[PDB]
Amino acid sequence: PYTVVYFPVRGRCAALRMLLADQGQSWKEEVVTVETWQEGSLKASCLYGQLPKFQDGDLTLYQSNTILRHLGRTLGLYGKDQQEAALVDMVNDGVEDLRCKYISLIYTNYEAGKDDYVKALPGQLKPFETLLSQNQGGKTFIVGDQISFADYNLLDLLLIHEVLAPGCLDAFPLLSAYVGRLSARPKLKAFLASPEYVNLPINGNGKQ
Amino acid sequence: PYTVVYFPVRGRCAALRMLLADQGQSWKEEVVTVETWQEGSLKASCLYGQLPKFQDGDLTLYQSNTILRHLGRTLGLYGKDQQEAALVDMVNDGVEDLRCKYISLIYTNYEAGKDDYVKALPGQLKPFETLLSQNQGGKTFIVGDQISFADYNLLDLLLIHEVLAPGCLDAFPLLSAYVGRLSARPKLKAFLASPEYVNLPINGNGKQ
């Protein structure tokens, strides 16, 4: 019932893929090639002229966060009540905020802005470490005592930054333990080690 | 029970303010002055070091969209089912995407990028006009037959662009009628005419 249409990269699909994997859900992948896109037909049909595009039965969605929230809402990974839902949201926006700057580094001024970015990274990771310390001492998830779509999206964000600035998680013991704890979940662990994940580039231009 | 803490501008608070007004809800405003902020005390306490900050009882939220979704979730402005909820979401992300570039124009290269931005505007407004035509012929709301937080967020976006590039909505008859229809809602109409709204600048640097 699930289908994700995206380029042959992890990018903004990595998280939602971790979500379906870990949740034990089946989905079909529809790879879009640098030519098909450029053929104009696809882009032209995409509401915002962008991928990912996702299909759920008779439902078609665009935008990564819309899909993530959708899966969370339907699969039950959106907090146990409105209050947790709002905090799950708050965490995702923050994640998205950093993802947004990350993407800007990679495709805009990688070579020339990498140093300043890594320098400014701690300042960016602190809020999530802080959020963690305020929830059962950063022992469970980022909000509540049950996993949420924001968890998968944060785990990805953390993961891709360790590749960008290895060790950047040394000074944030709660984030570090969080990455190891979630990364060890049976289905997710298997997924992240699989070729489907491991053999895909993180970004388009090959910069990481 | 509601309190919004923001600078003395409309910016990212305009929409949620329209939401509470139109919904007939009471809230208190806590203005933050260019001096308090820069004192360091506030910023330092803000999860992401940024405003708006919102309070619902002892519940504290940051990020405009988290607040908007929260109000939508608690006030019943989030679609009539999961399906509509996902589309409401999709619309807000798009709105936020254009808002994001708008803000970049205003605070980064207004004078030098204004022409290219207006030139590229139609291309940006089309998706919402298209979304409108596919819902009861753009006669009700942006999703479903009941208003949603995305409605308020889009109305604002349209409203502020009309001031940036007057007439920019003359090419979109469904968007135009949508702006006039919503702007005429009793409570909202009153609010938008009030000094509370009218006497606030749209952005920080006074560029609009």
From Swiss-Prot, chains A, B:
- The EC code for this enzyme is 2.5.1.18
The residues that hold glutathione are Y6, R12, W37, K43, Q50, L51, Q63, S64
InterPro entries documented for this protein:
Glutathione-S-Trfase_C-like (IPR010987), Glutathione-S-Trfase_C_sf (IPR036282), Glutathione_S-Trfase (IPR040079), Glutathione_S-Trfase_N (IPR004045), GST_C (IPR004046), GST_pi (IPR003082), GST_superfamily (IPR050213), Thioredoxin-like_sf (IPR036249)
Where do the GST C-terminal domain residues begin and end?
81-202
- Modified positions (N6-acetyllysine) are K126
Q: Point out residues bearing the modification Phosphothreonine.
A: T60
The record's subcellular location field reads: Cytoplasm; Mitochondrion; Nucleus
Which residues does this entry mark as bearing N6-succinyllysine? K101, K114
Q: Which reaction does it catalyse?
A: RX + glutathione = an S-substituted glutathione + a halide anion + H(+); prostaglandin J2 + glutathione = prostaglandin J2-S-(R)-glutathione; prostaglandin J2 + glutathione = prostaglandin J2-S-(S)-glutathione; prostaglandin A2 + glutathione = prostaglandin A2-S-(S)-glutathione
**Modified residues annotated as Phosphotyrosine in this record:** Y2, Y197
Which residue ranges does the record assign to the GST N-terminal domain? 1-79
Task: List the Gene Ontology MF annotations in alphabetical order.
Answer: dinitrosyl-iron complex binding; fatty acid binding; glutathione peroxidase activity; glutathione transferase activity; JUN kinase binding; nitric oxide binding; protein serine/threonine kinase inhibitor activity; S-nitrosoglutathione binding
Please list the GO biological process terms of this entry: animal organ regeneration; cellular response to cell-matrix adhesion; cellular response to epidermal growth factor stimulus; cellular response to glucocorticoid stimulus; cellular response to insulin stimulus; cellular response to lipopolysaccharide; central nervous system development; common myeloid progenitor cell proliferation
Any one Gene Ontology cellular component term annotated for this protein: vesicle
Top enzyme class of this protein? transferase
Q: How does it assemble?
A: Homodimer. Interacts with CDK5.
Q: Which family does it belong to?
A: Belongs to the GST superfamily. Pi family.
Per the entry, what this protein does is: Conjugation of reduced glutathione to a wide number of exogenous and endogenous hydrophobic electrophiles. Involved in the formation of glutathione conjugates of both prostaglandin A2 (PGA2) and prostaglandin J2 (PGJ2). Participates in the formation of novel hepoxilin regioisomers. Negatively regulates CDK5 activity via p25/p35 translocation to prevent neurodegeneration.
> What protein name does the entry list?
Glutathione S-transferase P
Q: Which organism is it from?
A: Homo sapiens (Human)
For this protein's source organism, the top of the classification is: Eukaryota, Metazoa, Chordata, Craniata, Vertebrata
